[PDB]
């Protein structure tokens, strides 16, 4: 909650040439984060992200063996946000977007989940947001990206061709195989006048004119793209040249973010 004078001051600062952010960041600069992985021994993979303003997210990865003819989608995401109802609009919108970005053909290599000519692994992604102060789409995306690159799966040791004669799948009791799937990343941008901002803060979201959601995968922009309202009292229309600017910005500065999440 901000007053009229605060909002006017902040908007005058942000919508200037050059733009002035309240903490002095550059238009493309991110804030520091802390990453932990592999701290839930009962899961195939896990991660925890802590933001500088107190935001925190926890991700768990679990698997199951299914018949990949009856089963159509091998990736499923479930989202829980503390303080919100299970049928809240924002929760279901985020769930839908995250299931769309990890669909079968999106840049996610689902051929690595196949065991035997009949069966496959199905991956369950569980997300729990402990504390948040703005739209937590990119934080959840970063946590999912971190957790999926440190996941291990059971190793099959019982035949591969079972079209004619089928045997129950059987797995080695100690060894596991690292999953080398290619996960995407999701970015959120803010529109303040004629400027574009990367990784906006809570107070910057209260004065923004509009927002954009852009997906990224292995060097290219990916299909799920949306316009989103970050507030309800200042949302307005924008000219078409700001969309191209945002796409170019994501294309230019995405590779640096990838190197920050390595290991």
């Amino acid at each position: 909650s901000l007053s009229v004078a605060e909002k006017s001051y902040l908007y005058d600062s942000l919508a200037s040439t050059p733009s002035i952010r309240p903490d002095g960041r550059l238009p493309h600069q991110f804030r520091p984060i802390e990453i932990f992985t592999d701290f839930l021994p009962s899961s195939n993979g896990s991660s925890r992200i802590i933001a500088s303003d107190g935001s925190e997210c926890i991700v768990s990865i679990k698997s199951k063996v299914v018949d990949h003819h009856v089963e159509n989608e091998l990736l499923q995401v479930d989202v829980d946000i503390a303080g919100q109802r299970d049928d809240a609009l924002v929760v279901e919108t985020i769930t839908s977007l995250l299931n769309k970005v990890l669909k079968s053909g999106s840049g996610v290599d689902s051929s690595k989940l196949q065991l035997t000519k009949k069966y496959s692994f199905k991956i369950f992604v569980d997300v729990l947001v402990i504390s948040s102060h703005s739209h937590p789409i990119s934080l959840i995306s970063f946590a999912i990206y971190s957790a999926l690159n440190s996941t291990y799966l059971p190793k099959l040791i019982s035949a591969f061709d079972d079209l004619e004669v089928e045997e129950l799948p059987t797995f080695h009791d100690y060894d596991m195989v690292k999953l080398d799937i290619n996960p995407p990343l999701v970015f959120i941008l803010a529109v303040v006048g004629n400027n574009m901002l990367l990784d906006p803060a809570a107070n910057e979201s209260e004065v923004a004119n509009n927002g954009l959601i852009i997906s990224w995968s292995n060097g290219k922009i990916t299909s799920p793209i949306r316009s989103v309202a970050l507030n309800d009292s200042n949302v307005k229309s924008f000219k078409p040249h700001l969309l191209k600017q945002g796409l170019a910005m994501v294309e230019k500065y995405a590779p640096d973010v990838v190197r920050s999440l390595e290991n």
Partner: protein, 241 residues
């Protein structure tokens, strides 16, 4: 068909009949999200507790002019066991029973009458679960409440005891809880008075006092560990600041 208690006096994980599991706790883990917080590890259990308040009530209906209102919320995740849960546990009768039991336990211990016209909220997240979860919940709530600087009379400690034929076993895990009946206790301070007593399966009438005594001694040891951790944290906090 397994050797729950071997003729040599050893359990399946290598413990003896009167030994606790590994006990680790942390205080002030979420400074930016709550007034008081704690992180509890008891064996393979992992619990996060947050305490918010005392603060202004959300609605004018939930206001009391003589004392504060206390609320407890418990969230059990779908990935807390080996097998993923099919549906949510938010509105089950078991969870509501747990929340009511915790509220009624801690109503008598917290001095709610010195915070009129306020509300205190407790939110709990269970990440991993390996038996004896109620005692862990009690211990986490106690630690988080003390970390928030809220007045109370004494500690409350939780413990679980299983009865295997004629042998009492202290601080059981998931394997033992699926093969015998268990008792859960809540003990106040260093006395013999019980705040909670919970028996859910059959137990012979002439075998309950011994179980109660064993559990009381175990809870005293648990209280000692919690007090030592709290004193160490306070010493570190005051030494430099």
């Amino acid at each position: 068909r397994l050797e729950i208690y071997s003729p040599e006096g050893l359990r399946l994980d290598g413990r003896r009949w009167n030994e606790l599991r590994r006990f680790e706790s942390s205080i002030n883990t979420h400074p930016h999200a709550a007034d008081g917080s704690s992180y509890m590890e008891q064996g393979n259990n992992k619990i996060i507790t947050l305490v918010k308040g005392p603060k202004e009530p959300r609605l004018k209906s939930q206001m009391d002019t003589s004392k504060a209102l206390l609320n407890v919320s418990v969230n059990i995740t779908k990935f807390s066991k080996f097998e993923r849960s099919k549906s949510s546990h938010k509105n089950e009768r078991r969870v509501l029973e747990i929340q009511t039991s915790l509220v009624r336990m801690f109503e008598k211990n917290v001095m709610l009458n010195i915070y009129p016209r306020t509300v205190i909220d407790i939110e709990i997240h269970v990440l991993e679960q390996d038996g004896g979860i109620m005692g862990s919940l009690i211990n986490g709530i106690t630690l988080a409440l003390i970390d928030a600087g809220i007045s109370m009379f004494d500690y409350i400690s939780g413990i679980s005891v299983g009865l295997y034929d004629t042998t009492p076993l202290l601080d059981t895990n998931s394997l033992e809880e699926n093969a015998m009946s268990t008792v859960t206790l809540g003990v106040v301070g260093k006395s013999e008075k019980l705040s909670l007593l919970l028996v859910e399966d059959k137990i012979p009438l002439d075998r309950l006092e011994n179980v109660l005594a064993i559990g009381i001694a175990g809870a005293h040891r648990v209280r000692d560990l919690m007090d030592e951790e709290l004193r160490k944290h306070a010493q570190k906090r005051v030494s430099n600041a």
